[PDB]
Amino acid sequence: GSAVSKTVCKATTHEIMGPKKKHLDYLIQCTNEMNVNIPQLADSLFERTTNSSWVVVFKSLITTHHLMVYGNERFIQYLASRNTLFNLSNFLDKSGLQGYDMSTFIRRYSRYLNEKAVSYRQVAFDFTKVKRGADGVMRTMNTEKLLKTVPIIQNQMDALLDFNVNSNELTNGVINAAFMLLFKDAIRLFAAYNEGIINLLEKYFDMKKNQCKEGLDIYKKFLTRMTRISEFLKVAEQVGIDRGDIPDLSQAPSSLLDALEQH
Ligand SMILES: O=P(O)(O)O[C@H]1[C@H](OP(=O)(O)O)[C@@H](OP(=O)(O)O)[C@H](OP(=O)(O)O)[C@@H](OP(=O)(O)O)[C@H]1OP(=O)(O)O
């Protein structure tokens, strides 16, 4: 409570760096305790986002993202249960140049976190965390749910990619901490998107005709998103990310010729 609220404050001070590991680890432990009240924890994070300073607000966003990734699932479950999440579409800190330049990224980052919650609410699992492979969810899913789901991923991916940062804009510790988390989410989200396309192609011939048509439209949009992903990983390459962590895209885009199995 007070110990929770104080830690939220420490995670979100005016200092120009991401939240410290020590405050983050305590918060993650908080999400794991059955007696902690999640809503009060969340509310303290939303309050920090009404501050006028870009640094405070960005750190609060980052703390929230880190909890959605490393915290107990009950945290993102609560976030998804609300009606309103972040409302920072018009944020602008004019106190200094860094302010003006960071404001745009705050807007875009907060929209991605909203979409991450909405996606959880729509499908009841986190795309980033579920079993991959051949024995996992994305892959062993009936044709109905599939046609339903893939479009939600696409939408979450689009919001992720609208962050649209260049190498030369990654110039302070706050925006870099955000980007590292965005990188992690992007790679897991891609894996899940790809697993679904694989399911589709597998099933795209044995299926009804109007289905086939929804299908086609997804494969379609996947191929342009492929291009955007690759531009995003190239930013990561330019910044210096270990090339071993960057995934190989050389995989599944040559078959656009079922645009004729609508024979
Ligand atoms: O007493 P600790 O739990 O070992 O942490 C204290 C201090 O806490 P206090 O403000 O109560 O003195 C700060 O911890 P946080 O407020 O960040 O939780 C931090 O000091 P700074 O804010 O100056 O970085 C630093 O711990 P650390 O070395 O892990 O950053 C250390 O302060 P001192 O070593 O100067 O006593």
171 and 111 inside one domain = no
**What method was applied to determine this entry?**
X-ray
Query: Could you tell me which residues come within 8 angstroms of residue 261 by beta carbon, excluding any fewer than 6 positions away?
Result: 204, 205, 212
To which H or E segment does residue 200 belong?
Answer: helix 173-203
Extract the tokens encoding 67.
């909890």
Residue with tokens 């891609």: 190
Rounded distance from Cα 104 to ligand 1 centre (Å): 32
Among 89, 124, 159, which residue terminates a domain? 124
- For residue 227, what are the CA distances in angstroms to 188, 197, 221? 17, 15, 10
Buried b (16+ CB within 10 A) or exposed e, 164-173: ebeeeebebe
Within 13 Å of residue 150, how many CA atoms lie on the same side as its CB?
A: 26
Ligand 1 binding pocket mutation candidate from 10, 16, 21, 27 (most atoms within 8 A of CB): 10
- The residue whose CA is least distant from atom 9 of ligand 1 is 10
Ligand 1 centre distance from Cα of residue 19 (Å):
13
Residue nearest to atom 22 of ligand 1 (CA): 10
Query: Is 106 in contact with 57 (CB distance < 8 Å)?
Result: yes
SS3 83: coil
CA angle centred on 55, ends 116 and 117, rounded to 5°: 10
CB 17 within 8 A of CB 174: yes
Report residue 244 CA to chain centroid gap.
21
> 124: which DSSP letter?
S
How far apart CA 123 and CA 218 sit, in angstroms, is 18
Determine how many CB atoms are found less than 10 A away from the CB of residue 139: 19
CATH of the domain at 159: 1.20.58.150
Which atom from ligand 1 is nearest to the alpha carbon of 20? 17
**Resolution of the entry in angstroms:** 2.0
Instruction: Kindly state whether residue 7 falls inside one of the protein's structural domains.
Output: yes
Specify whether 49 is located in the same domain as 162.
no
Whether the Cβ atoms of residue 75 and residue 113 lie closer than 8 Å to each other: no
Q: Judge whether 221 and 197 are in contact, CB under 8 Å.
A: no
**Is residue 135 in some structural domain?**
no
Considering the domain architecture, whether residues 157 and 81 belong to the same structural domain is answered as: no
In a domain, 47, yes or no: yes
Tell me how far apart the alpha carbons of residues 263 and 103 are, in angstroms, rounded to a whole number. Answer: 51
Q: Of the residues 67, 95, 124, which one is the last residue of a structural domain? A: 124
- Please, which residues have CB within 8 angstroms of residue 118's CB and are 6 or more apart in sequence? 80
CB 68 within 8 A of CB 76: yes
* Residue 132 forms part of a structural domain: no
Q: Which amino acid is at 257?
A: L
Q: How many angstroms separate the CA atoms of 3 and 43, rounded?
A: 14
Q: Which residues line ligand 1 (CB under 6 A)?
A: 10, 22
Nearest to 78 by CA among 46, 112, 110, 121: 121
CA of 207 to the centre of ligand 1 (A): 61
Residues 6+ apart with CB under 8 A from 41: 4, 8, 27, 30, 31, 75
Cα within 13 Å of Cα(139), Cβ side = 11
* Domain region containing 209: 142-263
Q: 94 and 34, same structural domain?
A: yes
Q: Judge whether 126 and 76 are in contact, CB under 8 Å.
A: yes
Q: Which DSSP state fits 85?
A: -
